[PDB]
């Protein structure tokens, strides 16, 4: 316990659309939620590797 923290047993997969699934986690150590949410948020918009379309010759 002195160096052990609670971890989530997560269940939620609600794809209201296939393009976006609603997910939920519980339980988390107090305050970790903001830490994890912010971190993943910053990762997802900024860091993702992908292909982009940019050119027109006309």
């Amino acid at each position: 316990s002195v160096t052990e923290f609670l971890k989530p047993r997560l269940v939620d997969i609600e794809q209201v659309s296939s393009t976006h699934a609603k997910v939920t986690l519980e339980p988390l150590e107090r305050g970790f939620g903001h830490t994890l949410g912010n971190a993943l948020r910053r990762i997802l918009l900024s860091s993702m590797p992908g292909c982009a379309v940019t050119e027109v010759e006309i």
Binding site: R30, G31, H34, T35
Partner: protein
């Protein structure tokens, strides 16, 4: 009707909880409602939270 009395005193230590009434000298009274993990608080570039 009574011919012996005993007096007992009890001491209570109290911290702050939501709903306590707080006041600033300039008529700025208000009740506090939250206790935050110190991480959440806004902090300056010098790393000091308010």
């Amino acid at each position: 009707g009574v011919l012996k009395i005993v007096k007992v005193y009890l001491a209570v230590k109290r911290r702050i909880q939501p709903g306590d009434k707080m006041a600033g000298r300039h008529g700025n009274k208000g009740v506090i409602s939250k206790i935050n993990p110190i991480e959440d608080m806004p902090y300056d570039e010098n790393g000091t939270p308010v």
